[PDB]
């Protein structure tokens, strides 16, 4: 069940684990970030070990892999947020109330970026008075997707003659996506928290 | 995994099964309904066999039983809806968009009734031109609850000094509840669909 690289949690259902800079796991996440955010300095990277959120996410992933008949349903994406939202996200994941703000709506859902530089905007990873900013690296079940539009509350049907068989997510552009929106709980697992500064 | 009394689904992930009137399972659900709705005539009762919704619900129930350290977290409640919403609910369960309407708000969530007679109101189980009305019997993870209020988007904390440790649901009255509101997916499994008429 729980990932093999996680630390022992001593009966706790949640903990944050600071990664050691210079070691493999920190470097892997740092590189994902610096692909588009190399100008920023990372104060720390924390592994989020949230047993319940992980279990529910993995159940949804198995279901999506069965339904779609392939295992190309997951992306690793980013989500910048304000400091006040971090304790909630760490425990409960992303909800439209705290993770739904956007410049151009592709639907009423939770939004995630392909590039860290998008989530690094101050409108998302709001800096505090000292410029400290927060961004998650998120496992997202994007599955089969289509272009979104304002005012969706669920993804569209794949075929309008079968209104309940839905796309798994929507995007701004199916050919060259920069963001994805998901509408259901347990399609997004907050995997790492990156605290950084201009 | 899947309940023992379900029919074989022949590789399908969802099906509705009409119950035989006069037999045990129909009678058990009918009695739950007639406790407060004996004046109404039941056209049919259908068992909802939704494999994915069931799996995700059961994972959430196990998690709630672990977290609360008891197994008194589930209630059997009711939810009346319009005919146009039934195919979606059967496949995907209840969302605030289709299941959130209420006369007095105890929060922005999905609402369920203790008594069938509440869900039998036309404002919920909207009748069609012929008076046909629809009501679900729903397994709901009410867990530990508190009184709600307008404008909640998640249940309150159990202790405001620990803002992320939340009640599982809210109600109109903790001593004599008539309704419950839940805020997260997978806290409500549509178990039976009752089609009835004045
Ligand atoms: N909060 C975010 O990082 C984010 C990412 C992609 C799109 C939007 N609207 C927000
Ligand atoms: N839709 C319903 O049956 C229902 C049940 C309880 C409360 C509310 N507001 C609605």
Numbering used by the authors:
A (entry chain A), B (entry chain A): 481 to 678
From the paper:
PARP15 is a mono-ADP-ribosyltransferase that targets an unknown set of proteins as well as RNA. Its evolutionary relationship with PARP14 suggests roles in antiviral defence; its localization to stress granules points to functions in the regulation of translation. Here we show that the transferase domain of PARP15 dimerizes in solution; the formation of dimers is a prerequisite for catalytic activity and monomeric mutant variants of the domain are inactive. Using biophysical methods, including X-ray crystallography and HDX-MS, we provide evidence for a regulatory mechanism by which dimerization enables correct target engagement rather than NAD+ co-substrate binding, and by which the two protomers of the dimer operate independently of one another.
Previous structures showing the wild-type homodimer suggested a possible mechanism by which dimerization might control catalysis: By enabling the salt bridge network at the dimer interface the R576 side chain, situated at the N-terminal base of the D-loop, might lock the D-loop in a catalytically active conformation. To test that hypothesis, we crystallized the monomeric R576E mutant in complex with the nicotinamide analog 3-aminobenzamide (3AB). The asymmetric unit contains two chains - each with a 3AB molecule in the NAD+ binding site - that superimpose with an RMSDCα of 0.14 Å but which do not engage as a dimer. However, each chain shares an interface with a symmetry mate, revealing chainA-chainA and chainB-chainB dimers in the crystal lattice that share the dimer interface known from the wild-type structures. In our structural model, the salt-bridge network central to the dimer interface is lacking due to the R576E mutation. Although this did not prevent the protein from crystallizing in a dimeric state, analysis using the PISA server revealed a further de-stabilized dimer interface: The R576E mutation allowed a shift of the D-loop base away from the interface, whereby the distances in Cα-atom positions increased by 3.7 Å in S577 and by 3.6 Å in C578. This coincided with loss of multiple hydrogen bonds at the interface. It appears reasonable to assume that these changes together prohibit dimer formation in the mutant protein at physiological concentrations in solution. In both protomers in our R576E structure, the N582 side chain is observed in a unique conformation: Instead of closing off the NAD+ site, N582 folds back into the D-loop and engages with the G580 backbone, allowing 3AB to occupy both active sites. The observed structural changes in the R576E mutant potentially explain a modestly reduced affinity towards NAD+, as observed in our ITC analysis; but this is insufficient cause for an abrogated catalytic activity.
